[PDB]
Coordinates of C-alpha atoms and ligand atoms in Angstrom, one line a residue:
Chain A
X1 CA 6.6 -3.8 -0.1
X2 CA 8.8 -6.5 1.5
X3 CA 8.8 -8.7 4.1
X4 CA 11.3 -9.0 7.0
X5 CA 12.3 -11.3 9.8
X6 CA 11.3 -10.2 13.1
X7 CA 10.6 -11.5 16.8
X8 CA 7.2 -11.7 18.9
X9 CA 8.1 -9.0 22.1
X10 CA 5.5 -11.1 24.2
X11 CA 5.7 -14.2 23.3
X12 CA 9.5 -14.5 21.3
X13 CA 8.6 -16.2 18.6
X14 CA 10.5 -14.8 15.3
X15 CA 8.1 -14.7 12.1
X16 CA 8.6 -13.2 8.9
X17 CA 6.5 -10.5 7.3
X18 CA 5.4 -6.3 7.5
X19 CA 4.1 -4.2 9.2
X20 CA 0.9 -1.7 7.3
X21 CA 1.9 1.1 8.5
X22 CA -1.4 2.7 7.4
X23 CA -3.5 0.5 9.3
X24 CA -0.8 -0.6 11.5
X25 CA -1.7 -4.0 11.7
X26 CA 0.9 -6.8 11.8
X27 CA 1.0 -10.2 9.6
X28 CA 3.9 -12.9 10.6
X29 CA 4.6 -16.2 9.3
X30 CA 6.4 -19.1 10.4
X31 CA 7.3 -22.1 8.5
X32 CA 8.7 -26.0 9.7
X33 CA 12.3 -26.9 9.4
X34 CA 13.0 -27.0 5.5
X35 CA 12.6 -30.8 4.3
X36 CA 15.5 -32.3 1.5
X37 CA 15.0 -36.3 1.7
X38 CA 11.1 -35.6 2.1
X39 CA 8.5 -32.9 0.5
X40 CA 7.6 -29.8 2.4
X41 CA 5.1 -29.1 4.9
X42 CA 2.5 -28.3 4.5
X43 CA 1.8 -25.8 7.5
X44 CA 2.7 -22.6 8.8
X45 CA 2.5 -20.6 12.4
X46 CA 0.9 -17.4 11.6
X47 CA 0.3 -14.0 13.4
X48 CA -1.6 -10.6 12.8
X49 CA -1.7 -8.0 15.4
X50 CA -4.8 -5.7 14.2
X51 CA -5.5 -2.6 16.3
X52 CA -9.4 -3.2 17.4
X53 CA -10.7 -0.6 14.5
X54 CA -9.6 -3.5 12.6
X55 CA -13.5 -4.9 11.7
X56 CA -11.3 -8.1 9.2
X57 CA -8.7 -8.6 8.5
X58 CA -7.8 -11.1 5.1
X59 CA -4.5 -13.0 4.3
X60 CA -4.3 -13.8 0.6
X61 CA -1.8 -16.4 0.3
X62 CA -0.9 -16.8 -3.3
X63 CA -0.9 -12.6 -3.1
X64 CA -4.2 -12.3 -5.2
X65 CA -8.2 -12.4 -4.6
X66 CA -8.8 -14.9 -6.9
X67 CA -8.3 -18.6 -6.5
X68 CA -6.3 -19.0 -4.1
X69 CA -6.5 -19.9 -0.4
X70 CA -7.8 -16.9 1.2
X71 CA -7.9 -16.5 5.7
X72 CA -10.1 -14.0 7.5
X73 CA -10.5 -13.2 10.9
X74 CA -12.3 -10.9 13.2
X75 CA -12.8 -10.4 16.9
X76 CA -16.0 -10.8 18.1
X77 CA -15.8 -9.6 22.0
X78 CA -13.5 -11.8 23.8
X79 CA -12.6 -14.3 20.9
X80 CA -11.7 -14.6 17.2
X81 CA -13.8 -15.7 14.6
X82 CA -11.9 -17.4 11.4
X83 CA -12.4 -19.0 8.2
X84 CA -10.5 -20.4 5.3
X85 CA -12.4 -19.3 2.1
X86 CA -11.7 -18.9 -1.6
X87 CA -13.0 -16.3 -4.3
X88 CA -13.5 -16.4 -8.2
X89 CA -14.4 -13.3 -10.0
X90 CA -14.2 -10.9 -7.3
X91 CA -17.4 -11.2 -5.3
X92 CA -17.9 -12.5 -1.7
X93 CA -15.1 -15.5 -0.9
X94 CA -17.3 -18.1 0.6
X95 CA -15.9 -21.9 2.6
X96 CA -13.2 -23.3 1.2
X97 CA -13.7 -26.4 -0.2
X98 CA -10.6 -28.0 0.1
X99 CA -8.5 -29.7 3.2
X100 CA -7.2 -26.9 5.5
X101 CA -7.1 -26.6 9.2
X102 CA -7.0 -23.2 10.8
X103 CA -6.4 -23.7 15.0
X104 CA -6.3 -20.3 16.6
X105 CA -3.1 -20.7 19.5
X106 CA -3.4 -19.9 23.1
X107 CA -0.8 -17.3 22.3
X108 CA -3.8 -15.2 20.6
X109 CA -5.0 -12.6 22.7
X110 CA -7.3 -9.7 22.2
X111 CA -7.8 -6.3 24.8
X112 CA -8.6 -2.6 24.5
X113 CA -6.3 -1.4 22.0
X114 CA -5.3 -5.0 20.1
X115 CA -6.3 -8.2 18.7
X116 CA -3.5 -10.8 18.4
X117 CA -4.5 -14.0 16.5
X118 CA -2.0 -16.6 16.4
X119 CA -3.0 -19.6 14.5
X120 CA -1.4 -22.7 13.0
X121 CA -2.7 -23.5 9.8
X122 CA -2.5 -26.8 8.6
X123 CA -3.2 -27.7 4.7
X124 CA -2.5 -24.3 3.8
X125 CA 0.4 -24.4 1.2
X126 CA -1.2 -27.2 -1.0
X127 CA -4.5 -26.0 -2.3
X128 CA -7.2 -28.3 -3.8
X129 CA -7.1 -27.0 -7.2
X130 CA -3.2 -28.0 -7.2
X131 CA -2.3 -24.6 -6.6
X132 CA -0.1 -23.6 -3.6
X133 CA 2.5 -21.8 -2.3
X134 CA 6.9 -22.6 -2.9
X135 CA 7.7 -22.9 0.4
X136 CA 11.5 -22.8 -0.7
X137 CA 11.1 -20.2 -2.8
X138 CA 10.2 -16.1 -3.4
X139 CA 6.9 -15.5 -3.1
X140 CA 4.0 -12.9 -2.6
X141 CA 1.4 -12.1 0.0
X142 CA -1.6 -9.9 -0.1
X143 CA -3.9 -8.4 3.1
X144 CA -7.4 -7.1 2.5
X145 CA -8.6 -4.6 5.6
X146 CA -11.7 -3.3 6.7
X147 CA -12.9 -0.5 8.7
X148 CA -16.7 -2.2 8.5
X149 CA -17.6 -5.5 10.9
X150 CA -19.0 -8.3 9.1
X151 CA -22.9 -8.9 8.7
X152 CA -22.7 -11.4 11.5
X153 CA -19.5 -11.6 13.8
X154 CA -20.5 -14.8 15.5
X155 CA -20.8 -16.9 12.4
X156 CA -17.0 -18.0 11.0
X157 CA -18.7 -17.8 7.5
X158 CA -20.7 -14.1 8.0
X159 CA -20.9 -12.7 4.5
X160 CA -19.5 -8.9 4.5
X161 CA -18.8 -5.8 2.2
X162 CA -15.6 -5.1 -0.1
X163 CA -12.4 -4.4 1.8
X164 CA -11.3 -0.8 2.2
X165 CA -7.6 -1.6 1.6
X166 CA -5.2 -4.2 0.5
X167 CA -1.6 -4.8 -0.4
X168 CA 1.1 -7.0 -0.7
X169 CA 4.2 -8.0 0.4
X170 CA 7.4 -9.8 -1.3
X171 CA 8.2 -12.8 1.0
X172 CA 11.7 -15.3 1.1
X173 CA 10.0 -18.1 1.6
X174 CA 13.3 -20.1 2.3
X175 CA 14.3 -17.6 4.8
X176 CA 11.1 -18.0 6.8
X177 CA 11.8 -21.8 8.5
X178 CA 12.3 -22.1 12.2
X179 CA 14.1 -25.0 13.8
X180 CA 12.1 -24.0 16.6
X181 CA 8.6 -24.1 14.9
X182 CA 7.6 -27.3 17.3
X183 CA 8.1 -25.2 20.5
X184 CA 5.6 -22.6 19.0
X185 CA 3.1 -25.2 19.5
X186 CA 3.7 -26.1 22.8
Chain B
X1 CA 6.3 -0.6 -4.2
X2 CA 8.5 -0.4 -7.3
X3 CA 8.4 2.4 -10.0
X4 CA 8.9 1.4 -13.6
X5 CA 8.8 3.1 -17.2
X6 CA 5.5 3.5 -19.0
X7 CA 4.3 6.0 -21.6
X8 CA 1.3 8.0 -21.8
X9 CA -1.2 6.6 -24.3
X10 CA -2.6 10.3 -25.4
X11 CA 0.2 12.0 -24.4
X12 CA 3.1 10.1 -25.7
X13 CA 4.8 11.2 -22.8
X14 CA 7.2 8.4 -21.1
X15 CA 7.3 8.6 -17.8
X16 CA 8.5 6.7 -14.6
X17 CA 6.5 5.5 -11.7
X18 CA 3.6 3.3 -10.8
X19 CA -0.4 2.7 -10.3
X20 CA -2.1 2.5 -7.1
X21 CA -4.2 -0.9 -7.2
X22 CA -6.6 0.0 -4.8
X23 CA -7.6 3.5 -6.1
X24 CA -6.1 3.0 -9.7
X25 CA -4.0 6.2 -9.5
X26 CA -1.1 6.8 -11.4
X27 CA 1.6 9.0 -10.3
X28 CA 4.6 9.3 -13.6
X29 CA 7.7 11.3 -13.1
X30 CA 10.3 12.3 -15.7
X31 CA 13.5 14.7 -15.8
X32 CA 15.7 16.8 -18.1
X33 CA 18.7 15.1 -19.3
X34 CA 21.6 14.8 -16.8
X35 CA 24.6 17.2 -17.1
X36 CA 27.4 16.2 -18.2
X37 CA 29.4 18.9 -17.0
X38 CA 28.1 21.1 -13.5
X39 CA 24.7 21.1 -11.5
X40 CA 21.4 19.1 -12.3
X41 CA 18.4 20.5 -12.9
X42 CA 16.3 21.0 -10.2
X43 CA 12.7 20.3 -12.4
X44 CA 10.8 17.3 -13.3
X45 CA 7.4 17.1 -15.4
X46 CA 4.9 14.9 -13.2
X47 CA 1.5 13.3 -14.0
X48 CA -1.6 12.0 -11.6
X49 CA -3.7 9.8 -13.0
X50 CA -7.0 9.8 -10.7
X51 CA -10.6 8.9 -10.9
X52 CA -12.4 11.4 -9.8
X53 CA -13.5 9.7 -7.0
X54 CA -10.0 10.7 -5.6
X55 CA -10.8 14.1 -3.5
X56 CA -7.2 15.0 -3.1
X57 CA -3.8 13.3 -4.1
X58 CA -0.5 14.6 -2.1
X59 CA 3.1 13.4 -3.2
X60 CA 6.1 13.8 -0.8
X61 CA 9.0 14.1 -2.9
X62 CA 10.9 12.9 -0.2
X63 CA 9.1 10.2 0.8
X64 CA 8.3 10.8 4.1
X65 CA 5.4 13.4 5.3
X66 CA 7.8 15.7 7.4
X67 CA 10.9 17.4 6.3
X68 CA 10.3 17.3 2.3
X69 CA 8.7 19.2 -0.5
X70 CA 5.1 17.8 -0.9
X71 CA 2.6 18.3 -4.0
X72 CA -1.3 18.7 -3.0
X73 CA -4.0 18.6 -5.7
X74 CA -7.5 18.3 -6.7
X75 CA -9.8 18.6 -9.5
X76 CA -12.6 21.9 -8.7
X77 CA -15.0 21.0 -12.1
X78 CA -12.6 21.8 -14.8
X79 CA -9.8 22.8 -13.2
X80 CA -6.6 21.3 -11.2
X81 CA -6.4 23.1 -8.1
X82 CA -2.8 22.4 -6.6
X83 CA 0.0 23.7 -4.1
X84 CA 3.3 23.0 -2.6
X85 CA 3.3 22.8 0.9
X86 CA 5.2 21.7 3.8
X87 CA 4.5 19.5 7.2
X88 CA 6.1 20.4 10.5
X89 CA 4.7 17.3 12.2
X90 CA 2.3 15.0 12.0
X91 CA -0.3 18.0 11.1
X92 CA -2.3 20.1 8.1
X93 CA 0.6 20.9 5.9
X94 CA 1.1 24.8 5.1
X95 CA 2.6 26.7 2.1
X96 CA 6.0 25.8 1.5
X97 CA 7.8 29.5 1.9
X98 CA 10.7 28.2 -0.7
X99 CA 11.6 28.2 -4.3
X100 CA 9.2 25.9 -6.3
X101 CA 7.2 26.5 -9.2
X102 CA 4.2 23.6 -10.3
X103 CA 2.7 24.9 -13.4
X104 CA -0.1 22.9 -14.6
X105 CA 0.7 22.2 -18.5
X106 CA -2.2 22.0 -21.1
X107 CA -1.8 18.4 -21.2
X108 CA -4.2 18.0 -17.7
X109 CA -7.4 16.7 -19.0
X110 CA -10.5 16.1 -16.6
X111 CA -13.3 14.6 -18.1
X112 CA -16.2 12.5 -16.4
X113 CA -14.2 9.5 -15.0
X114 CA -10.9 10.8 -14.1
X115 CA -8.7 13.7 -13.7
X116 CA -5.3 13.7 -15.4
X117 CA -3.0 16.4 -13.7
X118 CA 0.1 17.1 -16.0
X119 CA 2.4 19.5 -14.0
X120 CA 6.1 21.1 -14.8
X121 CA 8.3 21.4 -11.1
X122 CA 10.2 23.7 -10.9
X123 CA 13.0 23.9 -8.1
X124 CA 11.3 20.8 -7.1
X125 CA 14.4 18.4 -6.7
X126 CA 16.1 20.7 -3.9
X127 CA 14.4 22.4 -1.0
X128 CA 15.0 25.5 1.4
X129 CA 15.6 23.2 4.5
X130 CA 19.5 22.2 2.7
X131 CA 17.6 18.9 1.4
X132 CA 16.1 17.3 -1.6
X133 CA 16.7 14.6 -3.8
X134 CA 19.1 13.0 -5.8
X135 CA 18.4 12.5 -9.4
X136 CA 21.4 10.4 -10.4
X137 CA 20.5 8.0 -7.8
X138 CA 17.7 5.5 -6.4
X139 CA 15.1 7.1 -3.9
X140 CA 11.3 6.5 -2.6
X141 CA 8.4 8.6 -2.9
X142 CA 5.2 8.6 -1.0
X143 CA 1.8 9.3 -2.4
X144 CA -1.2 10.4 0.1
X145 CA -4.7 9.8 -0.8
X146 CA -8.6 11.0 0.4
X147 CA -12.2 10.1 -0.9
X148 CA -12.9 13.3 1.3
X149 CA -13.3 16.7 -0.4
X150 CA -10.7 19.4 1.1
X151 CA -12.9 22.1 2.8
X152 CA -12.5 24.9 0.4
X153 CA -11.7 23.5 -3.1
X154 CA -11.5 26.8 -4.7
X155 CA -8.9 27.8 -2.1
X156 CA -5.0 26.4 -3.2
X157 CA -4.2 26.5 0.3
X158 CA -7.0 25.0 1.7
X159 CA -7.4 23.1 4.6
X160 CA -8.5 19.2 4.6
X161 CA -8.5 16.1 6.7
X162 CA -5.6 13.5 7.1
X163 CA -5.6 10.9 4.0
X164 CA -7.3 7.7 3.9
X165 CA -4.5 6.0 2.8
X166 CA -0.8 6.6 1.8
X167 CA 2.0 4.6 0.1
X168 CA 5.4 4.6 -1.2
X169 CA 7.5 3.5 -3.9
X170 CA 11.5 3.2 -4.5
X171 CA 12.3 5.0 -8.2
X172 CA 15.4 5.0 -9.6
X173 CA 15.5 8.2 -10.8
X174 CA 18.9 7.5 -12.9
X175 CA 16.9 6.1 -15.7
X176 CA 13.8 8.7 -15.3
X177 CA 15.8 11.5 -17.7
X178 CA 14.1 12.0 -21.1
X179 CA 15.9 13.5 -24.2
X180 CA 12.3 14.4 -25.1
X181 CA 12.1 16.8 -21.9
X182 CA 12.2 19.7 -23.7
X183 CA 9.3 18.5 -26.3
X184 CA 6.9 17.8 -22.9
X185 CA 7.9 21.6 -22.1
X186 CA 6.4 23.0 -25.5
Ligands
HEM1 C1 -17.6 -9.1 -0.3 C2 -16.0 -9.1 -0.1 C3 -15.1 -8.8 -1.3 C4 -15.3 -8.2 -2.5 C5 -16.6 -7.7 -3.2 C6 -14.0 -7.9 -3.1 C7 -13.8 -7.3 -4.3 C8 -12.6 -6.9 -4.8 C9 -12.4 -6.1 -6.0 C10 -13.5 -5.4 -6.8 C11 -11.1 -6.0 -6.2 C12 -10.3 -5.2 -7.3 C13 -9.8 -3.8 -6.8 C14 -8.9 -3.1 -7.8 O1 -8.0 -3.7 -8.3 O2 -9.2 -1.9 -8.0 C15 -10.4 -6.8 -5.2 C16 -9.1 -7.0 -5.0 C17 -8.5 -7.8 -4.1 N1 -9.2 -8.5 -3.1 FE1 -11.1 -8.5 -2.7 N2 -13.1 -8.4 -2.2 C18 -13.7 -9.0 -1.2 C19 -13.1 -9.8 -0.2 C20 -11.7 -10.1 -0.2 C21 -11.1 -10.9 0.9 C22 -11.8 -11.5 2.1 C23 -9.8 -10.9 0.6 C24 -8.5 -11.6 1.3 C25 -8.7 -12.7 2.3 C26 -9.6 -10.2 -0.7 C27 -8.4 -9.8 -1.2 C28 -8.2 -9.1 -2.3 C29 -6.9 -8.8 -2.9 C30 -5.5 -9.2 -2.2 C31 -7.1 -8.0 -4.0 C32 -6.0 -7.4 -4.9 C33 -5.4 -8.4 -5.9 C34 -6.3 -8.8 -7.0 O3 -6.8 -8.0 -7.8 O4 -6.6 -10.1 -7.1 N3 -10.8 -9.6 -1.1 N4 -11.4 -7.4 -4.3
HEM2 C1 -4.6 17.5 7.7 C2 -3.7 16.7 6.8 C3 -2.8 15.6 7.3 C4 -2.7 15.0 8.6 C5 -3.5 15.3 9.9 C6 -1.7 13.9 8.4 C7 -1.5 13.0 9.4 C8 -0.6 11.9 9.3 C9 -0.4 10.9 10.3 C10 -1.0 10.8 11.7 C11 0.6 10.1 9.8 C12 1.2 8.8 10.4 C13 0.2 7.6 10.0 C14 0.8 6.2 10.5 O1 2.0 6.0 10.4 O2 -0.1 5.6 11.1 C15 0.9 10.6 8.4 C16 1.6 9.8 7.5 C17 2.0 10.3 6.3 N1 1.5 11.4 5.7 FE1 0.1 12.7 6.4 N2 -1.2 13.9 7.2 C18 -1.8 14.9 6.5 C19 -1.4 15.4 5.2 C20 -0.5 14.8 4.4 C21 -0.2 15.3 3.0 C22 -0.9 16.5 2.4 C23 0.8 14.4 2.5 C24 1.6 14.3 1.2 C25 1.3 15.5 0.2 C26 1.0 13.4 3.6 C27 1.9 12.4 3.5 C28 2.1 11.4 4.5 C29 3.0 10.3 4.3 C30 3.8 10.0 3.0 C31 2.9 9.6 5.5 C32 3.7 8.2 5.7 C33 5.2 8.4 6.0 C34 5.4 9.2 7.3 O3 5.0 8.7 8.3 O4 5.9 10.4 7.2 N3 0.3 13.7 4.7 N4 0.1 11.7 8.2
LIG3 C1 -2.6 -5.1 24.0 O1 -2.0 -5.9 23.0 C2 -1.0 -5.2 22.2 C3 -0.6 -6.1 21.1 O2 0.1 -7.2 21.5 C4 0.2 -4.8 23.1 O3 1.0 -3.9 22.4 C5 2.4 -4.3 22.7 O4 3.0 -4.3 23.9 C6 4.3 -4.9 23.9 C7 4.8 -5.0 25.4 O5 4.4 -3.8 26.1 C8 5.2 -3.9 23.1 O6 6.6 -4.5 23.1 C9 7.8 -3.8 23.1 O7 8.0 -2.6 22.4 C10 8.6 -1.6 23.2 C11 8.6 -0.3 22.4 O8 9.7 -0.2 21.6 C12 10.0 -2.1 23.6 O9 10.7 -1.0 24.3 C13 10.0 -3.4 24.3 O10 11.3 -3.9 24.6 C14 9.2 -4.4 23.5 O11 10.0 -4.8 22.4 C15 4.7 -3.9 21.7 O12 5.5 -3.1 20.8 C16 3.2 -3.5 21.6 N1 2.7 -3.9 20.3 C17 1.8 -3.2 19.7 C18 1.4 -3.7 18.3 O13 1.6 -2.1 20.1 C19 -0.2 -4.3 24.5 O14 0.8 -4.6 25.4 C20 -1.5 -4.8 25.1 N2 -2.0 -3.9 26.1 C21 -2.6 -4.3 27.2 C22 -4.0 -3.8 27.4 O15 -2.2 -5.2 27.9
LIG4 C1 -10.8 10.1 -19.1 O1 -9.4 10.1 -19.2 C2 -8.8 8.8 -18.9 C3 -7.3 9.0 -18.8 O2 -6.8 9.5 -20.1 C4 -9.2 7.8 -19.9 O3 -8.7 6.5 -19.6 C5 -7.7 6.1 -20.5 O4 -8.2 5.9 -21.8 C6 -7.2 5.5 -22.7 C7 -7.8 5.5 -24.1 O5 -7.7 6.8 -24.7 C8 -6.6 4.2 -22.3 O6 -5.5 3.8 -23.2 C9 -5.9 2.6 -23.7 O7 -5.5 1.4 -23.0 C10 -5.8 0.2 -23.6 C11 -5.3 -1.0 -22.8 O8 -6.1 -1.1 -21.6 C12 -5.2 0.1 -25.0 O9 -5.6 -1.0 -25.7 C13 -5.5 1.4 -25.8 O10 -4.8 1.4 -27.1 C14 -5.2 2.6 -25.0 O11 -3.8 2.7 -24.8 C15 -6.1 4.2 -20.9 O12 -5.7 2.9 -20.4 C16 -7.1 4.8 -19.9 N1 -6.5 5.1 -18.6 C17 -7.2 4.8 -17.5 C18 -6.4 5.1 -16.2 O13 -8.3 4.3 -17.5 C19 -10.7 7.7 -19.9 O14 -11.1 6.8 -20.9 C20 -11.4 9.1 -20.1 N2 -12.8 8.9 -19.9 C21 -13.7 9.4 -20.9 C22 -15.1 9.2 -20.6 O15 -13.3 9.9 -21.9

């Protein structure tokens, strides 16, 4: 599938990314201003907008299960639980061991139908293995979905079973920059 | 998604199209050669690919689940059970009331890890709503998928629940002609 640029009804802000349409849960990123004179970030605004039979919800961010940074969330009641974990060999991704900052935005909201979680994630790109994402380049993303809750929703690193979907999406990296980025976290 | 050229290991036949990831279904598609002088065909020889965990596999030749010509099979022990049929909404698709012919070819194997439907189409590329598709050109076609038996496998027009997941993928049918088309037929 492919990404696409597209604007936050609620709260404006314009992210790049897909819609699922099977699941019908939304994944957005937003990157900083492209750097020339220095390196690149290395942090991006996200957003997924799960319907609540949404038990997790995974970002894959080099767009594979294995070694790579991997994000999952899940609402438990009023509030979303995250982590930043990593997998080898396809089995249970536990803590990520690297640097990486995941700070859920007040912009996050969850109610009857919907959980919104909008985070900033900082450390993301550059992983500790040297792997990473090219922010100014083409790139892929994956989701993992589940239909299951996790063993224990109040613990960030609950253990949990196999995702019942997952895909991936081509993304433009160098299309997804905001000048704007430091007003999404105000 | 995007299709691309492959050819069946047993078979020898080359096909167009693409595996499913999550439930490791291939769906191929070839055509008769193009005319070079007056109508196209309106057949295609198709191939699924399932394990047999797959209950039932639709295609929508159109790529959409209203308004097209759609493909439902299964495997019923040792034998493909399949139909065309036709949605009118978001609802259990009925028998399509037009012209096309799916004749399983003695190619289709089951055997204890997978089912392998190998199918001839015919008036399959134009429908009796005025539409259909285009085979000189580039197009997307959908795939629908259930871990749920249908509720009468011995019955071609059974009933059954909505998938558990769906998908799509562009195909550029100008390059999915085969001089061997008439070999696959004999
Ligand atoms: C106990 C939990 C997990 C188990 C046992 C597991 C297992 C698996 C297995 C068996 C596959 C291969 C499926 C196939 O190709 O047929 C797979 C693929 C994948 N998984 Fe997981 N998974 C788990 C959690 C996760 C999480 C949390 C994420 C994302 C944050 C993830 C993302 C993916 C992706 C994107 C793929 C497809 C790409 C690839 O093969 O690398 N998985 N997983
Ligand atoms: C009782 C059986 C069926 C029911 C109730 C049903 C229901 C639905 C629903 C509710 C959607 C929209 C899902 C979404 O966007 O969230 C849909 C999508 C879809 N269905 Fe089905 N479906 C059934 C059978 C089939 C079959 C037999 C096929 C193909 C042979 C098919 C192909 C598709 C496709 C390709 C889509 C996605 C594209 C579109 O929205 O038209 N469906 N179906
Ligand atoms: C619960 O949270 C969900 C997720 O944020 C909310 O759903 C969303 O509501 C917004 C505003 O009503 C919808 O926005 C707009 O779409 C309509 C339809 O085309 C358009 O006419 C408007 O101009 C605007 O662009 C949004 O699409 C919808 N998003 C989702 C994924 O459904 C919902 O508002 C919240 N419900 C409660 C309990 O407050
Ligand atoms: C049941 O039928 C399926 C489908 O025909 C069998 O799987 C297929 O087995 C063939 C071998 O005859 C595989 O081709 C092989 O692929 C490897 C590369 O991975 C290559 O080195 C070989 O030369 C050959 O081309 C084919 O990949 C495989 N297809 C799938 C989807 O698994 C299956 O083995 C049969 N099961 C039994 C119990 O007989």
């Amino acid at each position: 599938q492919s990404a696409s640029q597209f604007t936050d009804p609620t709260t404006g802000f314009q992210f790049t990314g897909i819609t699922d349409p099977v699941h019908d849960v939304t994944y957005g990123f937003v990157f900083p201003p492209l750097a020339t004179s220095g390196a690149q970030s290395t942090e991006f605004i996200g957003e997924v907008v799960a319907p609540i039979a949404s038990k997790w919800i995974g970002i894959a961010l080099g767009g594979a299960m294995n070694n790579d940074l991997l994000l999952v969330a899940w609402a438990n009641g009023n509030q979303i639980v995250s982590s930043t974990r990593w997998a080898t060999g396809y089995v249970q991704p536990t803590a990520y061991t690297g640097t990486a900052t995941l700070t859920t935005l007040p912009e996050t909201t969850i109610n009857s139908t919907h959980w919104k979680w909008v985070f900033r994630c900082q450390g993301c790109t550059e992983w500790n293995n040297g792997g990473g994402i090219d922010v100014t380049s083409q790139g892929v993303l994956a989701w993992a979905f589940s239909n299951v809750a996790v063993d224990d929703p109040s613990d960030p690193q609950s253990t949990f079973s196999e995702h019942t979907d997952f895909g991936f999406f081509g993304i433009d990296y160098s299309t997804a920059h905001s000048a704007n980025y430091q007003n999404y976290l105000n």
